């Protein structure tokens, strides 16, 4: 006998959603919860309020779940209104993002389900920190979450980033603007390649009209924006270029019925009896018109308990601004036919990328070397970052293994120093170069046996696009 709201989505399978949650055995905790389904598909504020507090007036309701299709603003802030008006816990939402910003003061609320915008920026650095490729651009249009975003990527890009170049670029606001005028002055600086900003889908279609007008669409560039602008769903216009990779947390998240079970478990596990030090009996609210001063003592004890609760290998927790504390993460998705194909999974801090090189990127060379005396020194990697600072060279060494699987060009990129590497870093700037540096495997460098050559000359005679 606890009151749990449902999900009102105008499409889905409420049977799988019912069945998923009803196998979580919440005994050994205090009373057992319950569910009551209803549905709506309209997205105005008034229908939302007169349904939420109608259900509040009928049932002794503890908490509220909600998700409709893919509208973020048409839910957000309205929820912060009803939560602070009712002093009752409310789950995080699907069908809009539960993200972009829980900016109001959660001293009477708190609802959320999602990674923070900075945990997304940290994993966005570690992803581009898998191969090369330091932070290029700055967020140009006005996110409301801009000054924290840039002051966190600035405050981490200096005290712990492995030799990064400058950011000659700033923030404008082309909403009040007449058109393509000040966006023309920012398309010059904007060097190569870049990082895209946080904007809207319609205004991305706008800024891509300006970028197509100047010539930034092809041109050898890539673009990272973490999903919230254009990748909200499986729908994209054809005016998006094939460089427009983007990371989210979700293709198997909230909408899943096991996620629904997880959401049921977070509110329900935080029992009043589980609060053994403060065995208080919750007196739920009557209706959405009064009884707001009765929860002054109850909700503060509840605010401390939602953070790290233990579950059945699914320890979900929230920050003060409502995020995880180990959020569910996905990798960047890319394709070229209207374009999101899945490439990855991230949990704690791992990446386990599907390829060790980015496809779609002649002056690209492979170069094969050998570890030896004062010429090419091979040392191990940093145990916190993987890359190399002074060396700044992959040296993707292959492993010889059992004769049932191929070699390992995903073995960890051992540092390579010496005198020839310092020569190579000058010879690259002398004309125009691009490395693909890797080691020999048979270990028979500079040998001619009966018929053939081995080692570095062995990979010379096999015409493998080489230097030595």
């Amino acid at each position, epitope marked *: *006998s606890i009151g749990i709201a449902v999900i009102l989505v105008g499409t889905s399978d409420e049977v799988a959603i019912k069945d998923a949650h*009803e*196998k979580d*055995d919440f*005994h*050994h905790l205090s009373v*057992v919860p319950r569910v009551e389904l209803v549905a709506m598909n309209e997205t105005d504020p008034k229908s939302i309020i007169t349904r939420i507090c109608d259900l509040m007036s009928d049932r*002794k309701i503890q908490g509220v779940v909600f998700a409709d299709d893919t509208d973020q603003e048409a839910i957000a802030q309205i929820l912060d209104f009803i939560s602070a008006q009712t002093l009752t816990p409310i789950l995080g939402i699907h069908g809009g993002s539960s993200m972009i910003m829980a900016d109001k003061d959660e001293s009477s609320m708190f609802f959320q389900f999602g990674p923070s915008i900075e945990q997304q920026a940290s994993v966005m650095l570690n992803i581009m920190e898998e191969y090369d490729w330091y932070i290029f651009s700055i967020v140009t249009t006005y996110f409301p979450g801009y000054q924290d975003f840039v002051n966190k990527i600035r405050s981490t890009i200096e005290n712990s980033f492995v030799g990064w170049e400058l950011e000659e670029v700033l923030l404008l606001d082309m909403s009040l603007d007449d058109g393509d005028s000040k966006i023309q002055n920012q398309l010059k600086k904007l060097q190569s390649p870049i990082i895209l900003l946080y904007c809207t889908k319609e205004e991305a279609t706008y800024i891509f009209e300006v970028a197509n007008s100047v010539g930034l669409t092809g041109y050898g560039y890539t673009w990272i924006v973490p999903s919230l602008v254009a990748g909200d769903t499986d729908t994209v216009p054809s005016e998006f270029p094939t460089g427009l990779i983007s990371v989210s947390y979700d293709e198997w998240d909230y909408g899943l019925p096991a996620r629904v079970r997880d959401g049921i478990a977070i509110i329900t596990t935080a029992a009043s009896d589980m609060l053994s030090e403060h065995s208080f009996i919750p007196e739920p609210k009557s209706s959405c018109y009064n009884t707001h001063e009765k929860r002054i003592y109850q909700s503060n004890m509840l605010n401390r308990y939602l953070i790290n609760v233990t579950f059945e290998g699914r320890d979900l927790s929230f920050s003060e601004d409502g995020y995880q504390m180990h959020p569910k993460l996905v990798i960047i998705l890319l394709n070229k036919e209207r374009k999101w194909e899945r490439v990855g999974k991230w949990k704690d801090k791992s990446l386990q990328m599907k390829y060790y090189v980015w496809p779609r990127m002649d002056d690209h060379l492979s170069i094969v070397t050998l570890e030896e005396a004062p010429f090419v020194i091979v040392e191990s990697v940093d145990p916190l970052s993987g890359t190399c600072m002074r060396n700044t060279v992959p040296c993707q060494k292959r492993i010889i293994s059992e004769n049932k699987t191929d070699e390992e060009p995903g073995y960890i990129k051992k540092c390579c120093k010496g005198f020839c590497i310092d020569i190579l870093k000058k010879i690259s700037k002398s004309v125009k170069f691009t490395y693909d540096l890797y080691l020999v495997t048979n270990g028979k460098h500079g040998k001619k046996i009966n018929g053939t050559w081995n080692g570095m000359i062995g990979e010379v005679v096999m015409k493998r696009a080489y230097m030595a």
Partner: antibody
Amino acid sequence: VKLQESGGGLVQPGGSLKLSCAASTFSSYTMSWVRQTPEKRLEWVAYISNGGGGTYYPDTVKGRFTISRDNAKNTLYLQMNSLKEDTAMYYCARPSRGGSSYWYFDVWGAGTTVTV
Amino acid sequence: DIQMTQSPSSLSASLGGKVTITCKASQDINKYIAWYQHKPGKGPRLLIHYTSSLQPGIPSRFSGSGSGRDYSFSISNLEPEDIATYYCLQYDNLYTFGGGTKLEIK
């Protein structure tokens, strides 16, 4: 899905008779069953959740009763000890809408007797 | 746990009369009600939900009203296939039950 009881008896006065009720999806479905008085009262006997936890009784038969269930064979297990003054009929009842919570069944069993 | 007590002891009525039996629990139930009927040796049949919501296959012969912890349930227009005994259920804590009454025909 249908429920059929078995294991009926009170052949020892004050003994222990493990009765059962098999089902033919019952794994996500909790269980609680019923004895009947000579005044026919559908008094409760025991309580399990669907997941084996939540082992409880009402105040009539507390202190003597050993409780289990098996969702593989879709069966319950509880030995009747303090029905020794009754000529009761027992049936099994599977509450609707599943879960470790409880709702209103139409999914009841068949009905068998327990006699001293 | 919470325990219930129904009352009183009888459904003494003629063909098509009116009797009413009360759910009385030790604690507030918020209209947590059910109603069942069975022959001696046959097995229960559901009547009533939350808002006295009847069942498909169950006629409109059964109605009721009440709230909080006290509920009344009225039976009329009874055909003598309902030689039965009527019982009320509460589930605030895990399950709750009382005495209940049996039906006789005079």
